[PDB]
Amino acid sequence: GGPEQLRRNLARVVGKPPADVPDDLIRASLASYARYWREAFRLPAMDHGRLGEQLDVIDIDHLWSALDAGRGAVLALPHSGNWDMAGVWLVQNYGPFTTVAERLKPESLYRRFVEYRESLGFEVLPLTGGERPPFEVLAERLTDNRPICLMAERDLTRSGVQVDFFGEATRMPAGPAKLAIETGAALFPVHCWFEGDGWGMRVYPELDTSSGDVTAITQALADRFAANIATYPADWHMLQPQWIADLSDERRARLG
Ligand SMILES: CCCCCCCCCCCCCCCC(=O)O
Ligand code: NA
């Protein structure tokens, strides 16, 4: 949707009509969006070792004090900062992990993204066109006392979970919640942002998976995403539609 959609999105973040959203914020947000791509270019050619040592993660102990307990862990994060760089870090401070990526078309484009994220040292599973359901694999990883990483703030389909996000209705994936209730693994919200010419990363307290309510779980995970985004409102570079009302009557029919 571009800058116009980004504008309409930041509007919900700072409680403002889109036209009145501060321009310095918009400038910062687009600069972050541009930075992600500029970094994706060089990232495979950088020294992942130096980045493993130099960069850090606030309250990472949450993750360590769960894998050492043999549970496995769900690392659920929004599209903020550079999530690909945070992946590199984990590879260098744990090892290869498993995530999923929406299968793009053309396949030539998808094959370019896999070749990129494989050059960073982790495993991506497509949501379609697999020898198995990705959910099946991820569950077996969590059972093998391992961590997974999942983009968890946007899933605009019939499978999506109707949650409130900055006081408006959107839909987020249930994957993080189901895999957590099932394997009993720890569900950790995670946030990434840009910190000067560097990178910021933080792991947050695990959520209550007891109730079994996927809805209230995903909701609490959105309330955490929201608070973190409002803390770094220029790092959440979402240029695609997020909220339902920003969709056409056509694209909204697609989700029932
Ligand atoms: C602080 C803990 C570290 C966690 C590291 C998170 C790694 C996330 C990488 C997953 C990539 C998923 C790509 C799908 C998103 C897209 O391209 O639209
Ligand atoms: Na202006």
Numbering used by the authors: 48 to 303
From the primary publication:
Here, X-ray crystallography, site-directed mutagenesis and enzymatic activity data are used to define the three-dimensional structure, acceptor/donor substrate binding, membrane binding and catalytic mechanism of PatA from M. smegmatis. Our results reveal that the enzyme has an α/β architecture and shares with other important eukaryotic/prokaryotic acyltransferases an acid/base catalytic mechanism involving conserved histidine and aspartic/glutamic acid residues.
Two other crystal forms were obtained in P 21 (PatA–C16-2) and P 42212 (PatA–C16-3) space groups, and the corresponding crystal structures solved at 2.90 and 2.43 Å resolution, respectively, by using molecular replacement methods. We have decided to use the PatA–C16-1 crystal form for our description since it displays the highest resolution. A close inspection of the three crystal structures revealed that the protein crystallized as a monomer, displaying a high degree of structural flexibility in the N- and C-terminal regions (coloured in green in Supplementary Fig. 3; root-mean-square deviation (r.m.s.d.) value of 1.6 and 8.4 Å for Cα atoms in 41–47 and 288–302 residue ranges for the N and C terminus, respectively). Strikingly, one molecule of palmitic acid was unambiguously identified in the difference electron density maps of PatA–C16-1, PatA–C16-2 and PatA–C16-3 crystal structures. We believe that acyl molecule is associated to the enzyme due to the hydrolysis of palmitoyl–CoA during the isolation and purification of PatA from M. smegmatis mc2155. The acyl chain is deeply buried into the hydrophobic pocket, and oriented with the carboxylate group facing the groove and the acyl tail extending into the globular core of the monomer.
